């Protein structure tokens, strides 16, 4: 029933994070990202994969990538999603750094997405420059693949865990409780990344890092940056989860309000990248 191989055509390979594929809905000629999951391998049951799907279908924010259903071919399950043209924010970075204004514009958008998710008692659990995507016209939205309901543990045993601890909050690392306020902390780290091009301690060894995050003082923006940027970051990267603002509260923080510009003006970066990159 409904063979997805002839329903869709796989093109290039896109994102690693596996096997996602740029592809075309052969019927409507509309471009999509297709994640192809093994099920014969899995082996985190199917009830987790079916669970990861049920959550996605619940999401309908235009700040999070739209889920377009899934199809089964033998033992392989194609999950189909709203394809974003511009690519990752981490990719866009490759053509040179960002305006404190472009940065702010993004964060405002991410924040809008994060509110939606937080309102619906969901977390994202994987906020990095890499999972922030742009459209051809510069709309900023969250790769929905992170998304998860509050309860019954994210990481467990495969295609759920985070490989890198860099953006991880300290109450996550210490295994203790942790809710939507650990999302905020990543947004903090994401900001520093968007500013500097990589999260604090990229030079370091992941095991070492993981033990430092809770022991140390939080990271902080360093350099040629408006005091309200630096302040915005310290709002996020407070080590006590409750001392961190909600999403909405941050949407009103001076750094955003002073600095965010029209979301269309982001097509600057898509047009730069485009100009910069061969092939």
């Amino acid at each position: 029933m409904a063979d997805p191989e002839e329903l869709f055509t796989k093109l290039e390979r896109i994102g690693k994070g596996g096997e996602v594929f740029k592809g075309i809905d052969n019927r409507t000629q509309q471009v999509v990202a297709i994640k192809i999951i093994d099920l014969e391998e899995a082996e985190d049951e199917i009830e987790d994969i079916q669970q990861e799907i049920t959550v996605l279908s619940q999401c309908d924010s235009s700040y999070v990538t739209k889920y377009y259903g899934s199809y089964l071919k033998g033992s392989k399950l194609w999950i189909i999603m709203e394809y974003l043209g511009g690519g990752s924010a981490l990719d866009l970075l490759r053509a040179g750094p960002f305006d404190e204004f472009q940065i702010a514009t993004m964060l405002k958008e991410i924040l809008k997405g994060l509110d939606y998710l937080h309102s619906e008692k969901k977390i994202h659990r994987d906020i990095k420059a890499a999972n922030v995507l742009l459209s051809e016209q510069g709309d900023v939205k969250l790769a929905a693949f992170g998304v998860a309901g509050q309860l019954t543990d994210t990481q467990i045993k495969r295609n759920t865990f985070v490989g890198t601890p860099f953006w991880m909050a300290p109450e996550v690392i210490q295994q203790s409780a942790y809710d939507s306020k650990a999302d905020i902390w990543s947004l903090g780290i994401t900001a520093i990344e968007l500013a500097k091009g990589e999260p604090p301690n990229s030079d370091m060894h992941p095991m070492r890092v993981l033990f430092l995050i809770p022991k140390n003082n939080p990271p902080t923006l360093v350099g040629d940056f408006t005091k309200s940027f630096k302040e915005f970051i310290d709002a996020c990267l407070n080590k006590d989860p409750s001392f961190r603002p909600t999403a909405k509260e941050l949407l009103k923080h001076k750094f955003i309000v002073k600095n965010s510009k029209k979301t269309s003006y982001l097509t600057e970066l898509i047009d730069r990248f485009k100009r910069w990159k061969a092939e």
Binding site: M1, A2, L39, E40, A42, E43, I46, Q50, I53, T54, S57, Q58, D60, G69, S70, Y71, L72, G74, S75, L77
Partner: protein, 325 residues
Amino acid sequence: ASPADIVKNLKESMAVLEKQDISDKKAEKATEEVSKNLVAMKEILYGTNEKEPQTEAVAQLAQELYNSGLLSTLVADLQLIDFEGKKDVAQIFNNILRRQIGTRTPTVEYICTQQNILFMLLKGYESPEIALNCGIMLRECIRHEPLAKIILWSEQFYDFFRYVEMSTFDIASDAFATFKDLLTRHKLLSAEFLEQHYDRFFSEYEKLLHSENYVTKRQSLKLLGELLLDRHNFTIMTKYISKPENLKLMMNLLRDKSRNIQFEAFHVFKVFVANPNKTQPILDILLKNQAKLIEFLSKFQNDRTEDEQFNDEKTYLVKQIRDLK
């Protein structure tokens, strides 16, 4: 806003929905009041502004809902509603559901009236645009001990085997989810069913163990095992583990295309070959094959080690097989 805003809602905006052509009046404006007043619910029904779901506000509210079949023709048509409105309706249903007096809910007491409130939901499974919402609400009420007994015994219960075999995965998944949550949720209430409806049920269930569809085949085979070792279902298993029809089929699932499928069959296979009081049809078919089953169980997924309990059962099965008679 009070009960004086549920009236100006359900009578005016709601009842009007099922009537419209393609007007500019009910294009968005009239459907907006429908959607806006559902958000007004979740405000008083759930977290009031900053604070918690009020106990003050419910008293003079929950009763005004049962006034007429107001949630009858509400469910008797969706799609035309809203995406985030459907989401509210779901949670609006699912938060007053637990409104309780003493240790019994006034919801259950005044759902059990004209019970066709639930027949609508299961039937929502064929409308792909709502199917998921219906299941979401449905599971939340078959969650209650007295509530699920209503559906279990239905005639249109046996519609599931067509629902589960629906093409669109996510619906064919969510179908099996309500399927399970009934035959499990209440262990005492469930055992009541399988005995009085063994013949019709397991002939229908056997259809599943054939269908492939990798997932439908798997989940069903797995759900089989759970239902047998339930121990509230000791009567049912001794019954099922007796027909040689069932054991014949298991044997072939072990020869399956799929690794995970084979192993998932070995979990119903062992149950047959472990029964203290094995009946004659089983013992006959086992002896008949005995010679070359040892040949199969010698090299059966020899890598999972790892699983002693697997291998401890492995040798145990070859004892039974080699020893009879």
